[PDB]
RNA sequence: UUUUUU
RNA sequence: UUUUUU
RNA sequence: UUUUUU
RNA sequence: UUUUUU
């Protein structure tokens, strides 16, 4: 028998199971007021711990589907969240004024309703819900890194989007305690992330300012924790008209097993379809078989070759056991790409004067690229020094 | 007659027998409160010695099957546990408030009910049961090694999972007396281990934080006490397009009998199907015929060749009678793989300048690998020195 | 024998294994209430 | 993010 | 576990 | 008996 | 009579 099929058992599910998750959709007549009080209860730091998915789904249905609930129920968002296990029950209250009136009579909701009794809500318009969802979308690139990287990329996008002047956020939203709260809100809730990823891909026509902000930040979330996929598919597995060809640094007999297992675990990622870019942010299925520790030499060689082409990839951190092979593959790819561009300049130049012009241009191009790579490595070194200074501050 | 069939008698069962094990499934209306008091009685150190399988199965049915017991009864978990001998009887109590009311009237349950009279339970939510099962899943890689290795890998995974911020465990769960208790709970109970292995393989869609933690730790449990299977199938029995070919260190006439008996006892392991990775952790059938002492030279040569490819396998311990042949096979495979990569570099390089680039790269690659192998050997030497210091401390 | 794809035999395999588990749990239910009916008739015969 | 001129 | 840039 | 790493 | 190891 084929004894090498033992290594592939226990991988792929043979009888797939989902767990039911009951999520409460609120339906009043004063729906914009209920959604603005859910926004104010989230901004106040009040932990609404079981009604979080229900409050965020009330906000998202009221923004994108106009709180209709039959347009929402037949949408592909609701088909996806039904297949992922969620069950929507719509509780109704025809004369409900405040969010305090709408909470059920379970006894663990008592600290929530005594917190919501003393909470002051400001009267606000229809355009606060799209402002809140656009602010929650800014944390989606570098969500899977951590809280510091998300807050830094979020404040950089606040300055970019206010430099266009199209939005303004209030100044207590940009305090880092409040941004820490909104990071934990987006990290702990699956359906807000999926609704923002879906409506960033698919709501494309007739744009508001808020919907263009959400689509811009969702377009930067693509392969957010899947750098090894972009580096291997762009540089190792080379695409040409003959087919797929390996790199010369990976054609020996000790890394070809790792590229075979990477091809297999890669083709199980495209089973997710159009959310396969968004696989680590949504925590999908096959992302445990795309870790760096499963493929140490392939990740280090691929990051070295990708650093040798794009100069801004020298600021990624990596583990200590991968840095030195990464630097060796970087130096080998700089010499190999220099030999290739010299031979192509000899191919395409039709006279020696043109050949001298092209050789001076491509020499100056590589010197510019090398100076940019040293500048971004020094930026990484004082960035880690400022981080360790903040470590020894506390 | 074939007299060499005498060596294969008494191996495989000819009339297979199972023993009935009666396990008590509790069914109240206040099921989350009963399961949280079972969690609090496990955390307190109270030995609930006959109701352990019943309490853990009550927790697992209430988490994964929503305490439905007709969804559970027709699941493949219950078919597997019926074929493995367990019999479920569901006792019912429609108005049962505490776990004290639900214990039967056997006289050996008297120290349990006097311990449960004075036990204080804290009111807690639905999300404590998944937290407890996710904490019990962290001990599953390196379960079959021992208690120190399980607690060390568990605390490393606590720091990894809290560095993502997705969970927090209370600080008295991370005391090593409490982790020693939870190790003995998971080690002494078959059905908690199997339910976590099944739901780590098969619950894959629409993930919670807890279910992704359980699937991550079950994906590291694959071949947990079956290192000889991974080393022999990856390096000795070489897979290529022509077929299976032996390694040059094992093609003589004294190790070929051991690889024939390893092929036979290996093909009886894949009779277990999709739990054949999980064979030592679940204590399945053919794992006594995969011991290192049955195949001393094949295990030492396979571990040497696997150390010569992957540099982190120099930190495995082995017995004293296998270390020296392992070091000889390691040195022979370093020289053999160096000769092969030199011949393949001569094959794939199209010019001598490219050949000099590739020879400098692959030389630097082997020097990096050799320095990492000496670093992990020195890590093993002060790890065993710290262990013997703890031996002479007591 | 009766499927056409691997997806079709995966759906039919999941159906017939759930159907066999349904009839086995029903058979055990009938056996337990048969045992309790015989025990109650013997308790009435001992009472009478 | 965009960046000139008419 | 993840790590850049836009 | 098992022994690494992720 | 049997004699190791796992």
Numbering used by the authors:
A (entry chain B), B (entry chain B): 1 to 394
C (entry chain A): 347 to 394
How did the manuscript describe this experimental structure?
The nucleoprotein (NP) of Marburg virus (MARV), a close relative of Ebola virus (EBOV), encapsidates the single-stranded, negative-sense viral genomic RNA (vRNA) to form the helical NP–RNA complex. The NP–RNA complex constitutes the core structure for the assembly of the nucleocapsid that is responsible for viral RNA synthesis. Similar to EBOV NP, MARV NP possesses the structural domains: an N-terminal arm, an NP core composed of N- and C-terminal lobes, a disordered linker, and a C-terminal tail. The core structure of RNA-free monomeric MARV NP, spanning residues 21–373, features a typical bilobed fold consisting of N-terminal and C-terminal lobes, as determined using X-ray crystallography at 2.9 Å resolution, which is similar to that of the EBOV NP core structure. These two lobes are connected by a flexible hinge region and are considered to clamp the RNA strand between the two lobes by electrostatic interactions.
Here, we show the structure of the MARV NP–RNA complex determined using cryo-electron microscopy at a resolution of 3.1 Å. The constituted complex shows a left-handed double-helical structure, in which respective strands have similar dimensions: each strand contains single-strand RNA, and 30.50 NP subunits per turn and a 128.99 Å helical pitch (rise = 4.23 Å, rotation = 11.8052°) with the outer and inner diameters of ~330 Å and 255 Å, respectively. In the cryo-EM map, the density of the nucleotide bases and most of the side chains are clearly visible, which enabled us to build an atomic model unambiguously showing six RNA nucleotides enclosed by the N- and C-terminal lobes of NP. The respective asymmetric NP subunits, NP-a and NP-b, show very similar conformations as shown by a 0.592 Å backbone Root Mean Square Deviation (RMSD). In the positively charged cleft between the N- and C-terminal lobes, six RNA nucleotides are encapsidated with a “3-bases-inward, 3-bases-outward” configuration. In particular, the interactions between NP and RNA are predominantly electrostatic due to positively charged residues such as K142, K153, R156, and H292 with their side chains pointing to the phosphate backbone of the RNA. The N-terminal arm (residues 1 to 19) protrudes sideway from the N-terminal lobe and has a short 310-helix η1, which is associated with a neighboring NP molecule within the helical complex. Similar to EBOV NP, the N-terminal arm of MARV NPn occupies a hydrophobic pocket located on the C-terminal lobe of NPn+1 via L6 and L9. In our model, helix α15 of NPn is associated with α16 of the adjacent NPn+1, which is mediated by hydrophobic interactions between a hydrophobic patch composed of L249, L325, and L336 on NPn and a hydrophobic region composed of I357, F361, and I368 on NPn+1. The structures of the asymmetric unit, a complex of an NP and six RNA nucleotides, was very similar to that of EBOV, suggesting that both viruses share common mechanisms for the nucleocapsid formation.
